[PDB]
Amino acid sequence: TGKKEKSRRIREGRVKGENFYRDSKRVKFLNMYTSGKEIRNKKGNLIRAASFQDSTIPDAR
């Protein structure tokens, strides 16, 4: 019971992967090594382009 994230957050004071290790800030940094990736549906076509690959021509004024 003491080894639960609930009890830890209570005794101390969100993102997937916050443990006794690896706070908020650290999880985002470590996810960089993986999820520069390209999302697709089951038939195959772009839902969400990869990071820094948005492919929209902005209004450059």
Next chain:
Amino acid sequence: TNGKNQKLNKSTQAVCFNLLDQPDSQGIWATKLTRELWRRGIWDDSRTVEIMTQAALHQDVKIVMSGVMFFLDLNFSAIHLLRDPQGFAEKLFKEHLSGKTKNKFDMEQKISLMQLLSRLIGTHKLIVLGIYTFFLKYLTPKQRDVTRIMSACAQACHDLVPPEVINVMVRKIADEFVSDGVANEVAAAGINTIREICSRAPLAIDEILLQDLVEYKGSKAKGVNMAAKSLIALYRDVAPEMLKKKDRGKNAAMEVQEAKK
């Protein structure tokens, strides 16, 4: 823990007293310790507040500041264990700020002394009358961090002081903050620190300048408008006859119409 060992506390308060006598710096280890024990709730006693009073009345700056920051921490319950708050404030204002004009404290410490004096005064209905001319040197918008000084000016106002010595203050502020050409923040600060004076001392500015200040209702700047509306709503419930018919808002005017006959 179980019971308070008075034989020990009364003994180790005597060493704090006998340290604060040594005028070099050695009362640091009395002040820094008594603050900790007060915060831990171990030394809630009248004998201890005297130690920090003597520290505030000391000559060393880092001891006087320890005492002042203790009595600050909006103040804490230690004020309700003092032996004479009026004489305390009088001795402080006489020794540190005005008396010798030694010019030891910097502005950041003078402001913290002012805060303590005004917050004691407003809370306990004190009368010194030198405060209100000491503020006037520092009540200029060309001065260093005046928003703290003027926020303590109001805190030393009462229902029970001669409003002329506050009229001079209000007419200094009005001459130097809501005059011709002044900026929006400056004028809004002036009006905001005048209305929270008048919330304690209502008959400290007369109708003729009240009207001059409610001029600024529709001021297009959104600081001065929010400020003037506060003064109007303050005198709508207190002395609505000073306001003109245009400002008496549907109930002050009705109360005056029934009570004027």
Next chain:
Amino acid sequence: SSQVREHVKELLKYSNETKKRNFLETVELQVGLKNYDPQRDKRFSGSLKLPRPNMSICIFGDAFDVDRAKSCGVDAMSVDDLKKLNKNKKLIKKLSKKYNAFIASEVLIKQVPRLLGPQLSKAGKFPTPVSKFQLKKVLCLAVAVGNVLVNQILMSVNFFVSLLSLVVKSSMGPAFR
């Protein structure tokens, strides 16, 4: 109730058991109740009252007031019956302490703090214009109600609970709860 009446009756008989200490025994009520903490500012104040305090008041005034209140049997004072007193703190404190209360004209309650400033404001007897039961720091609170009139006791008690054991007493008499 008339359980007050049986108390006050043989208090008035105690009136005639240890008769006189060559003065008059005032009547007092001591309030005792719980459930409140005055170290927090839970303050109360009310002055909706009417006695015989062997009336000893000091009115400050002007020419228009001193010859008004030379009748009346009252101690009176000029403005410079006060101006020539500030030089001595214990002198200005002795008059402080002399009188049960203070009053003054509508003109002089702008000038009185420049003269009698530190005193007369913490003492809780500051003057009041002409033409109390403060919960300062304690749970104990006693008030003088009358003299040697059972109505006054209840009259004050309902006001005290209005504001929020009860005891009635005289100068040397016993306590009646």
Next chain:
RNA sequence: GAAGACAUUGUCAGGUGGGGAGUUUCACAUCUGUUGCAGAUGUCUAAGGGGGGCUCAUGGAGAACAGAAAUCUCCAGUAGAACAAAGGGUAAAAGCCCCCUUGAUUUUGAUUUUUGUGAAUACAAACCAUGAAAGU
């Protein structure tokens, strides 16, 4: 021999337990912290009615101290002023001042926005305010 009403054994109740199982992946701005912040104080969240009188902004000329701006007088001035910043509407006013009031009141139904309300809208009876009145 040792030990002894404790240990043990039985049932409950807390703790630990990836060793193992299953599973998922509304506002300007003084007063405390993270960085130039989310938070705490206090501080705005707003005078409508119906009668009268009068014209505003700005510019020009002119008057001791008085000047670019202090008060006074005259001329021009369709709004360039104000009415909760480049826009509509308003000039014997929808604006400023003055007089009187507080219809920002109840009852009965009708319409638009909108099936839920609220909002606005007109409509009749009463108590009322206002002006000499029409009328509101």
Next chain:
RNA sequence: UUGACAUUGUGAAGAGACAUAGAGGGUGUAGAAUAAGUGGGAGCUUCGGCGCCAGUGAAAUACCACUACCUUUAUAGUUUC
């Protein structure tokens, strides 16, 4: 793993607490003195010692009531260890 109950019987000696009945207390400094504090005030008097009027002190002491804390005395019983 730690606690309670049961198994679980026969004896003894001690410590703490409930609960009542009591008993007394207060040095920051000045002040005759060690001032919880508050409110009534100028003697019940064995003494007129004294209380009032006199300093000094935020607060003034006799006399009598209130209701805060602190520390101790005893065990009808109550229990725990």
Next chain:
RNA sequence: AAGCUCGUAUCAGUUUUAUGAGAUUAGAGGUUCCGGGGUCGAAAUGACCUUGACCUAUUCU
């Protein structure tokens, strides 16, 4: 797809006619009485010394 009130004349991817809708003070100097140095000062709200920020006169709309 199954039908049921009845068989009017109302309708129409159409036409016609009328009619509405910001930065620059170098040049002058005054202050900071919280930034004070300087020979001096038992002692001083000073001779003056600079860092300054301050109130200023300029330019565009």
